[PDB]
Amino acid sequence: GSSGSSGHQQLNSLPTMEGPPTFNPPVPYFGRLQGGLTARRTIIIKGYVPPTGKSFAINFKVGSSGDIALHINPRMGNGTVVRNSLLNGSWGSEEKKITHNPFGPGQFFDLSIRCGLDRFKVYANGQHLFDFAHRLSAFQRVDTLEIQGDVTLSYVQISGPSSG
């Protein structure tokens, strides 16, 4: 009484994330950034916090090496989104600073992170959520965006230099 099977003749990695945006992406959702953290890059995450989900987490690893430059994790309970960054065999620190926490169990939430040169700019439903100080100088290297935990992703697309 069991169905479904991975079946992989030879372990390999998924192709590029080109083409149209993702629809109803599973979790954890692993979305590699084509290019990397570039001043002209904007990350967008449209999902919804389930009533049975404690909280999720959005970590940004590097496709090249594999280090986390930014690790944001919202907290529906207390109401504080912690920010960290795991470095090569090392770790950064815990950063908490927000004006309004929309993330709520039972209601949708539009999150959009902006990649810049001095720092990042996260927005929530048209509201400056918080900023992320450049911890890893090699931020540009970061070309991987993964999302684990308890979150209902609906639409995910890594806006790039395309629009122009």
Residue 12: both structure tokens together = 């390999």
Determination method here? NMR
Structural element, H or E, at residue 10: none
Residue 28: both structure tokens together = 């954890």
Burial class of residue 112, CB neighbours in 10 A (0-12, 13-18, 19+): middle
Domains annotated for the chain, with CATH where assigned, are: 16-164 (2.60.120.200)
Pairwise CA distance, residues 158 & 75, whole Å = 24
2 marked ligand binding residue: no
Tell me if 44 sits within 8 A of 62, measured CB to CB: no
Cβ neighbours of 43 (radius 10 Å) = 22
- Closest-CA residue to 148 (of 23, 27, 26): 27
Pairwise CA distance, residues 45 & 129, whole Å = 14
Pairwise CA distance, residues 66 & 62, whole Å = 4
Structural element, H or E, at residue 109: strand 108-115
106 marked ligand binding residue: no
Cβ neighbours of 147 (radius 10 Å) = 21
Tell me if 147 sits within 8 A of 56, measured CB to CB: yes
97 marked ligand binding residue: yes
Residue 96: both structure tokens together = 């908490």
Residue 68: both structure tokens together = 């986390």
State residue 96 phi and psi, 5-degree precision: -125, 120
91 marked ligand binding residue: yes
Pairwise CA distance, residues 127 & 118, whole Å = 20
18 marked ligand binding residue: no
How many residues would you count in the chain? 164
